[PDB]
UniProtKB/Swiss-Prot annotation, chain C:
This is ATP synthase F(0) complex subunit 8. Subunit 8, of the mitochondrial membrane ATP synthase complex (F(1)F(0) ATP synthase or Complex V) that produces ATP from ADP in the presence of a proton gradient across the membrane which is generated by electron transport complexes of the respiratory chain. ATP synthase complex consist of a soluble F(1) head domain - the catalytic core - and a membrane F(1) domain - the membrane proton channel. These two domains are linked by a central stalk rotating inside the F(1) region and a stationary peripheral stalk. The chain holds residues 3 to 33 of 67 of the full protein. It comes from Sus scrofa (Pig). It is found in: Mitochondrion membrane. Component of the ATP synthase complex composed at least of ATP5F1A/subunit alpha, ATP5F1B/subunit beta, ATP5MC1/subunit c (homooctomer), MT-ATP6/subunit a, MT-ATP8/subunit 8, ATP5ME/subunit e, ATP5MF/subunit f, ATP5MG/subunit g, ATP5MK/subunit k, ATP5MJ/subunit j, ATP5F1C/subunit gamma, ATP5F1D/subunit delta, ATP5F1E/subunit epsilon, ATP5PF/subunit F6, ATP5PB/subunit b, ATP5PD/subunit d, ATP5PO/subunit OSCP. Belongs to the ATPase protein 8 family. Signal peptide: none annotated. The chain crosses the membrane at residues 6-22.
Swiss-Prot record, chain D:
It comes from Sus scrofa (Pig). The keyword Ion transport applies. This is ATP synthase F(0) complex subunit f, mitochondrial. It holds the Pfam family WRW. The modification N6-acetyllysine is found at K9. The chain crosses the membrane at residues 55-72. GO terms for cellular component: mitochondrial inner membrane; proton-transporting ATP synthase complex. Belongs to the ATPase F chain family. It is found in: Mitochondrion; Mitochondrion inner membrane. GO terms for biological process: ATP biosynthetic process; proton transmembrane transport.
Curated annotation (Swiss-Prot), chain F:
It is found in: Mitochondrion inner membrane. It comes from Sus scrofa. Subunit a, of the mitochondrial membrane ATP synthase complex (F(1)F(0) ATP synthase or Complex V) that produces ATP from ADP in the presence of a proton gradient across the membrane which is generated by electron transport complexes of the respiratory chain. ATP synthase complex consist of a soluble F(1) head domain - the catalytic core - and a membrane F(1) domain - the membrane proton channel. These two domains are linked by a central stalk rotating inside the F(1) region and a stationary peripheral stalk. It is a multi-pass membrane protein. It holds the Pfam family ATP-synt_A. One of its GO terms (molecular function) is proton channel activity. This is ATP synthase F(0) complex subunit a. It catalyses: H(+)(in) = H(+)(out). Belongs to the ATPase A chain family. Keywords: ATP synthesis, CF(0), Hydrogen ion transport, Ion transport, Membrane, Mitochondrion, Mitochondrion inner membrane, Transmembrane, Transmembrane helix, Transport. The lineage of its organism: Eukaryota, Metazoa, Chordata, Craniata, Vertebrata. The chain crosses the membrane at residues 3-23, 65-85, 94-114, 133-153, 161-181, 186-206. It comes from the Eukaryota. GO terms for cellular component: mitochondrial inner membrane; proton-transporting ATP synthase complex.
UniProtKB/Swiss-Prot annotation, chain G:
This is ATP synthase F(0) complex subunit e, mitochondrial. Belongs to the ATPase e subunit family. It is found in: Mitochondrion; Mitochondrion inner membrane. The chain holds residues 3 to 45 of 71 of the full protein. GO terms for biological process: proton motive force-driven mitochondrial ATP synthesis. Its main location: mitochondrion. It comes from the Eukaryota. One of its GO terms (cellular component) is mitochondrial inner membrane. Component of the ATP synthase complex composed at least of ATP5F1A/subunit alpha, ATP5F1B/subunit beta, ATP5MC1/subunit c (homooctomer), MT-ATP6/subunit a, MT-ATP8/subunit 8, ATP5ME/subunit e, ATP5MF/subunit f, ATP5MG/subunit g, ATP5MK/subunit k, ATP5MJ/subunit j, ATP5F1C/subunit gamma, ATP5F1D/subunit delta, ATP5F1E/subunit epsilon, ATP5PF/subunit F6, ATP5PB/subunit b, ATP5PD/subunit d, ATP5PO/subunit OSCP. The gene is ATP5ME. Keywords: Acetylation, ATP synthesis, CF(0), Hydrogen ion transport, Ion transport, Membrane, Mitochondrion, Mitochondrion inner membrane, Phosphoprotein, Transport. The keyword Phosphoprotein applies.
Length: 42, 72, 31, 81, 81, 221, 43, 95, 72, 72, 72, 72, 72, 72, 72
């Protein structure tokens, strides 16, 4: 709403590199899948 | 069966605190000699000493966590 | 104990708070 | 009527329930009022004291104690009857 | 010692007059007064009751009632030894 | 028993970890006037004092990261200090958020370095100067040394706080038990003495966590 | 500034004190043999 | 053009309990009324095992004691140091 | 029994981490005395200290990783 | 089989105090050489030495307490 | 029974890497104090330091390889 | 079995004298170089050395006491 | 059985290499400080360094041979 | 099965001599440094050196004696 | 059964020889820094060291012989 314009410069200027959270998401998903498989094996 | 093995493993693992003791002894010992060089800047060297002691403690504290983990 | 594979909520909430709330409040400062 | 709940008459409680409209102000409005009522009275002064934060910390401690009751009474009880 | 002089002596002079006036078994002469107060309660109990009165007065009455409630708890500790 | 607080993601009918982790932000009012009360003047003075001591190394590009680092240090420091309360729940205990903190910033630095200074960013693997004739041996040393940074950076934080709380709880249990058998106030003396160190050990961890990232960023900037 | 209080409450306090003492004594007497019986049965 | 702040907020007894509660029960309970209610509440909570004595209680005692000592031994200096900064800023701008 | 052997081996494996504490204590002890001698080259001294602390941590965490792998 | 197996585990967890026996010696040794070059400022040096010795012995008492817990 | 022997042998042989940390801490500390006196000669000092660091880490790696061999 | 599981903790509890020996070596060494720096301050140096050695040996003997009490 | 004895003996014996690593660390540390102080004496300084390295390596190789003998 | 306990307990208590062997070198090492700066006072430096050496060797002989007592 | 205990005890006994390897580096290290000053005064310096090396190795050998004794 009225908060995007406050830090819009930051988001589109310098956090471009820091915006790579894909590695963390993939690692978390893989860990969760492995844990689910282990739990299902029982 | 397993109780004895876990207890002896915990007792063996708890010997990792010697390194931290030696390190903290060494750092504070260096501080007193360094201070004696010039009484000025004592707060700065003191800050360095405190940082070193805290870092050594952090590097040596997670040994007991494994002992508590094996115990429970 | 610390590994129970329920890590989604904490990560989402931490990202939200750190990257929105604190930066916005800390930006309104003078020096 | 529209006066404060501590001022409404006992038999006028159903009447003030009809006057409860806009009192939540979409729920969030009541919280908006409540935050500023305390903040502008015990913090936003020329010179405050430690009493500004101690109330909040004590409330946090008591709220935390309310959650763990289940486990404590489960086995931490000393005697019986 | 000196703190005892500054508190216990005020305990026996200031706190003594503060409490002994309000904390003492009552004279039998006030029993009819209490009965008349019971009649005051009954008159509202039959009809009127709240009579659209202030919430604050009810809160005062409830708080004093809770203070009265505490003494019965104290008695159990006294008997428990 | 002992492992009750740690494995307890704010037990309730609906999880409230978000409420617990967002609570610390309600302690830093934002300035709105030229001259303000005492509670915010100290905050801004502290922020000014801390800023000039750490971000005074980077030339121009590192000055952009100033807000992020200050927010990070304030957040971790506020989270750790609030956990000393008798029945609190420190979110930093959980490994999940520690793992979700280290990886993004480390990745940002490492592939920011390659984007602009690829020639020099590739050279940092080989130590500067001539390292005799042992080049292939140390080349594989520093590259594996690269990957261990986030793991240690998370694990030390995940470990030390738990160790401290375990010590406090065990000493409390010990001083409770010895009430029945004999009289010994040495244990409560140990507790009150250790509490000072546990109180002042958090801020050092905050400082180290921020400083290591500062150094890592400055290398590739 | 000491203030005299309503005597009506004043009597009601002491009455409850006496009654609480009585209840505590009677309940202790009731529960004393039962506890020993339960402990002996547990053996 | 924000109007000036009031010089003081509210008065609190023991640093945790405000004066308005004491004023509210004054006509009925008296001068020393509410303290008895507080003590009775503590005794009732302890007797019926609503609050359980565990290892955490001593840690709570120690944690509270440290803060009380710090507040009592450094309260005034922090306040005076807080005032001095505003004084300096005002002087600079006026000059 | 095999699980008991794994537990005792993991417990005895962690004792090698004590080397990290002594090395950390030594490296930091040198920085203070060296700085005190020549309070001019703060930057190079701190860079070398940081390099040393980064390199010295590898062995202890390596041993801890070996213990974690063998236990599980 | 239980208490006998705990006897060795408890005994093997009292080695961590040995590491606390070197830091104290290093600390007092530094005090001797440190003041030898600056005969004044004895009091602050003594205070720093006492602080270091107390810290190291507390680190040893950590392992001693763990050993005490293991038995029971 | 052979698996238990392999596990305990691995858990005992892994201790030998402890000395690498102490040596690394020693060499880096020497570089710090050495640089303080003659900053001009910082080019030659490193070659020596690297040599020592590499040698100590090679010894530690050799011990680790022996432990891995006894495990498998 | 109880006797078999005994005398092994007693053997493992006597390895704690190494730190005391290292500290007792370290203190007297520091005194030598300290004396050579300034022969004038001798009696105070000797008093400090004696205090340090006594404290270090007092810390060391704890392991022997534990080993003996477990033995009998 | 014999295999478990061989495994345990080989694992325990191969830990005597930390001393050699610590020795190598100290020798190189002294060399850099020594050259730093007095230049134009590299021959003798390098000579002493080699001798020390050879002595420490021989000391470690003795334990390695002992482990070899125990295994076979 | 008690003979096995005797053998392994004697083997475990033997490791107590590392402290003396490590402590001996620091005393003799310190002596060389102290003599270089002030050769004149060569006589006094010895008494202290030999006192430290005697103390360290006695501390090692204690562990030797306890190991011999356990083995017989 | 007794043979396995014999092997384990023989393997564990050799651990204590790490002290000599640690001390030799310190001894020769002192020679380098000592020779750095007053180089011409060299004969006496070398003599002092030889004695320290001999004593350290004698202690190491004294530790070792019990292993062969217990093995046979």
């Amino acid at each position: 709403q009225f908060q995007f314009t406050g830090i819009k410069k930051y988001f589109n200027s310098y956090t471009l590199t820091g915006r790579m959270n894909c590695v963390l998401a993939t690692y978390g998903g893989i860990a969760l899948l492995v844990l689910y498989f282990k739990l299902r094996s029982k | 069966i397993d109780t004895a093995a876990k207890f002896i493993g915990a007792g063996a693992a708890t010997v990792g605190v010697a390194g931290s003791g030696a390190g903290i002894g060494t750092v504070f010992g260096s501080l007193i000699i360094g201070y004696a060089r010039n009484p000025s800047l004592k707060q700065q060297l003191f800050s360095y000493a405190i940082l070193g002691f805290a870092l050594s403690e952090a590097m040596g504290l997670f040994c007991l966590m494994v002992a508590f983990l094996i115990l429970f | 104990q610390l590994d129970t594979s329920t890590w989604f909520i904490t990560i989402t909430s931490m990202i939200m708070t750190l990257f929105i709330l604190f930066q916005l409040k800390i930006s309104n400062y003078s020096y | 009527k529209d006066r404060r709940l501590l001022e409404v008459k006992l038999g006028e409680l159903p009447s003030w329930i009809l006057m409860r409209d806009f009192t939540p102000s979409g729920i969030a409005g009541a919280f908006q009022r409540g935050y500023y009522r305390y903040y502008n009275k015990y913090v936003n002064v020329k010179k405050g004291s430690v009493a500004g934060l101690s109330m909040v910390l004590a409330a946090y401690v008591v709220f935390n104690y309310c959650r763990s009751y289940k486990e404590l009474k489960h086995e931490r009880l000393r005697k019986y009857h | 010692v000196n703190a005892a002089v500054t508190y216990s002596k005020p305990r026996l002079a200031t706190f003594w007059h503060y409490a002994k006036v309000e904390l003492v078994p009552p004279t039998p002469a006030e029993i009819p007064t209490a009965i008349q107060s019971l009649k005051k309660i009954v008159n509202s109990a039959q009809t009127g009751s709240f009579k659209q009165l202030t919430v604050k007065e009810a809160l005062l009455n409830g708080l004093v009632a809770t203070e009265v409630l505490m003494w019965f708890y104290v008695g159990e500790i006294i008997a428990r030894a | 028993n002992l492992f009750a607080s740690f494995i307890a993601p704010t037990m309730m009918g609906l999880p409230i970890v978000t409420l617990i982790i967002m609570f610390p932000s309600l302690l830093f009012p934002t300035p709105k006037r030229l001259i303000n009360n005492r509670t915010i003047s100290i905050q801004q003075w502290l922020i000014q004092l801390t800023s000039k001591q750490m971000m005074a190394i980077h030339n121009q590009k590192g000055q952009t990261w100033s807000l992020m680092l200050m927010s990070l240090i304030m957040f971790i420091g506020s989270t750790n200090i609030l956990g000393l309360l008798p029945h609190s729940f420190t979110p930093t205990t959980q490994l999940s958020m520690n793992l979700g903190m280290a990886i993004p910033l480390w990745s940002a630095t490492v592939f920011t370095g390659f984007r602009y200074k690829t020639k020099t960013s590739l050279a940092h693997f080989l130590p500067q100067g001539t390292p005799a004739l042992l080049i292939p041996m140390l080349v594989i040393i520093e590259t594996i040394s690269l990957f261990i940074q986030p793991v240690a950076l998370a694990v030390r934080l995940t470990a030390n706080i738990t160790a401290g709380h375990l010590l406090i709880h065990l000493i409390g249990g010990a001083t409770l038990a010895l009430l029945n058998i004999n009289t010994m106030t040495a244990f409560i003396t140990f507790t009150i003495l250790i509490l000072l160190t546990i109180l002042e050990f958090a801020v050092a961890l905050i400082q180290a966590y921020v400083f290591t990232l500062l150094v890592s960023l400055y290398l590739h900037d | 500034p000491p203030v005299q209080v309503s005597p009506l409450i004043k009597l009601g306090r002491y009455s409850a004190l006496f009654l609480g003492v009585a209840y505590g004594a009677k309940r202790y007497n009731y529960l004393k043999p039962r506890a020993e019986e339960e402990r002996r049965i547990a053996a | 053009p924000v109007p000036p702040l009031p010089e003081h907020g509210g008065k609190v007894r023991l640093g945790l309990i405000p004066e308005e509660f004491f004023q509210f029960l004054y006509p009925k309970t008296g001068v020393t009324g509410p303290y008895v209610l507080g003590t009775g509440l503590i005794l009732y909570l302890l007797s019926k095992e609503i609050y359980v004595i565990t290892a955490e209680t001593f840690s709570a005692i120690s944690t509270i004691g440290v803060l009380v000592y710090i507040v009592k031994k450094y309260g005034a200096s922090i306040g005076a140091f807080a005032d001095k900064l505003n004084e300096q800023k005002i002087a600079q701008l006026e000059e």
